[PDB]
Amino acid sequence: HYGITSPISLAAPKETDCLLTQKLVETLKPFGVFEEEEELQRRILILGKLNNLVKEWIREISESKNLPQSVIENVGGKIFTFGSYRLGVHTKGADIDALCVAPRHVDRSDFFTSFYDKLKLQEEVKDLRAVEEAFVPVIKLCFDGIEIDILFARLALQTIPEDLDLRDDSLLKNLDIRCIRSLNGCRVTDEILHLVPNIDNFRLTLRAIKLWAKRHNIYSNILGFLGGVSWAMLVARTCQLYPNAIASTLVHKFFLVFSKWEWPNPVLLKQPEECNLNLPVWDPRVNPSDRYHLMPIITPAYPQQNSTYNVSVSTRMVMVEEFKQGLAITDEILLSKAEWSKLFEAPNFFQKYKHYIVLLASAPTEKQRLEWVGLVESKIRILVGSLEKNEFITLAHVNPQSFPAPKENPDKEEFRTMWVIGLVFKDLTYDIQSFTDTVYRQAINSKMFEVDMKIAAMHVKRKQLHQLLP
Numbered sequence: 001h002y003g004i005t006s007p008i009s010l011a012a013p014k015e016t017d018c019l020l021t022q023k024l025v026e027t028l029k030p031f032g033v034f035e036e037e038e039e040l041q042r043r044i045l046i047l048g049k050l051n052n053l054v055k056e057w058i059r060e061i062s063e064s065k066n067l068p069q070s071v072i073e074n075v076g077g078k079i080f081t082f083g084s085y086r087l088g089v090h091t092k093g094a095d096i097d098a099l100c101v102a103p104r105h106v107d108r109s110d111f112f113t114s115f116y117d118k119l120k121l122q123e124e125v126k127d128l129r130a131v132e133e134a135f136v137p138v139i140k141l142c143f144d145g146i147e148i149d150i151l152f153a154r155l156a157l158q159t160i161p162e163d164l165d166l167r168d169d170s171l172l173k174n175l176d177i178r179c180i181r182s183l184n185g186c187r188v189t190d191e192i193l194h195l196v197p198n199i200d201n202f203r204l205t206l207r208a209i210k211l212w213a214k215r216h217n218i219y220s221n222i223l224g225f226l227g228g229v230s231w232a233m234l235v236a237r238t239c240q241l242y243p244n245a246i247a248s249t250l251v252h253k254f255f256l257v258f259s260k261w262e263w264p265n266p267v268l269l270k271q272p273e274e275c276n277l278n279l280p281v282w283d284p285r286v287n288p289s290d291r292y293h294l295m296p297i298i299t300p301a302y303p304q305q306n307s308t309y310n311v312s313v314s315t316r317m318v319m320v321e322e323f324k325q326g327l328a329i330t331d332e333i334l335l336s337k338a339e340w341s342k343l344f345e346a347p348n349f350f351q352k353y354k355h356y357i358v359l360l361a362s363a364p365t366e367k368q369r370l371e372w373v374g375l376v377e378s379k380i381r382i383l384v385g386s387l388e389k390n391e392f393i394t395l396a397h398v399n400p401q402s403f404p405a406p407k408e409n410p411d412k413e414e415f416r417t418m419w420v421i422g423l424v425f426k427d428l429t430y431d432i433q434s435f436t437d438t439v440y441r442q443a444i445n446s447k448m449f450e451v452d453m454k455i456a457a458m459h460v461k462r463k464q465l466h467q468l469l470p
């Protein structure tokens with residue numbers, strides 16, 4: 001079977017679960033969860049165009065390197081996809097994650113120069129922006145209105161066979177880490193798709209879970225919660241444990257299983273083999289550092305890593321409790337005492353805590369507000385870390401959903417967004433100032449700050465929140 005343990009139940013559904021699974025599908029449609037068929041066709045044709053451009057590009061490089069006409073006639077080249085799109089659970093408006101795989105005679109500097117220019121002169125391309133210096137180098141663009149983030153990797157192969165499988169550990173044999181990191185995404189995705197008993201049932205379930213997580217304010221890797229990959233792996237492990245169940249049951253078992261999971265025991269999709277290479281691998285047995293991890297969900301391809309080391313005490317608490325409520329609602333639905341709609345109802349965040357901290361960030365230009373909000377959000381965990389060390393606080397729940405904030409000037413217009421943070425006690429002015437000072441500081445030190453880029457935080461009581469809001 002699938003997994004590092006035996007399944008929990010091999011039971012198949014009853015017609016009763018089949019019609020219950022159809023009502024789920026129906027409850028999801030209004031939420032944009034399912035992309036339109038005409039649009040999926042649009043995206044398919046778009047990738048074909050891209051795949052060809054990559055082919056065309058590589059051939060030209062194969063010619064400038066004068067390689068024999070035999071090689072030139074067989075070098076190949078290919079565009080691989082990964083993440084939600086490749087998983088089959090991308091929603092309306094979601095971006096596409098792609099990797100460009102080329103043979104050895106095409107360097108990375110070629111990707112950022114020869115290939116970048118080729119995209120630059122295509123009629124369908126817009127917003128062609130590159131980031132050659134990121135953790136995972138990437139060229140971003142908007143192809144016919146579709147956001148596409150493209151990684152790049154150079155393999156030690158002379159030619160790229162159409163049936164190349166990127167899971168073969170040998171492919172990493174002595175390669176630049178940049179290349180290794182760029183391959184990780186596809187491998188992890190391709191692994192997940194090969195570790196679940198029934199993909200179709202996996203897709204529909206993942207669909208339901210991601211909506212639920214987003215609606216319940218716990219969807220964000222950056223802010224210490226879970227991102228697409230993490231949710232996909234949790235859902236996959238659930239499938240491995242109920243190989244013959246369908247979506248209505250899996251969604252339920254998802255909550256049954258994880259609301260009772262004993263953290264920090266790690267969530268693994270397969271047994272980790274040992275490989276000669278010396279790459280970072282999550283392993284509490286050899287690495288003491290990895291023992292402090294709170295809610296580990298490990299990547300299935302070498303080198304395995306914890307996809308959620310941003311999860312703190314607060315976030316872990318929040319999600320554990322959210323799993324319990326989740327289990328409860330599905331329990332009713334399964335007893336026909338509730339509708340699937342009840343699972344996707346968002347409990348008013350602005351009313352579920354007796355205290356809150358509100359983050360205000362703004363810049364002089366819409367262009368800047370967007371850039372500023374970027375930097376700010378990456379630092380919000382710092383404040384939570386502080387709020388946590390405080391002896392009077394139990395947890396800080398940052399709502400990963402920011403938004404435009406009220407006017408602070410009736411005259412000139414304003415580009416100001418805001419955040420609302422949940423609090424739970426067992427004054428806060430000092431911790432908030434350290435944060436504020438630290439944000440203004442790190443931003444300025446890393447040359448990513450402009451005069452008039454403001455950031456203010458303030459404590460507020462529930463009753464007073466509704467004021468500083470719509």
Ligand SMILES: Nc1ncnc2c1ncn2[C@@H]1O[C@H](COP(=O)(O)OP(=O)(O)OP(=O)(O)O)C[C@H]1O
Pocket residue numbers: 082083084085094095097184185186188189227228229299306307
């Ligand atoms: N920790 C990770 N391990 C392996 N692959 C990762 C990891 N983080 C990101 N990726 C890959 O990069 C992709 C980044 O997009 P991200 O938004 O994080 O997830 P996604 O599920 O593809 O997208 P959605 O949020 O569902 O739209 C997702 C996955 O294919």
Ligand SMILES: [Mg+2]
Pocket residue numbers: 083084095096097
């Ligand atoms: Mg994505």
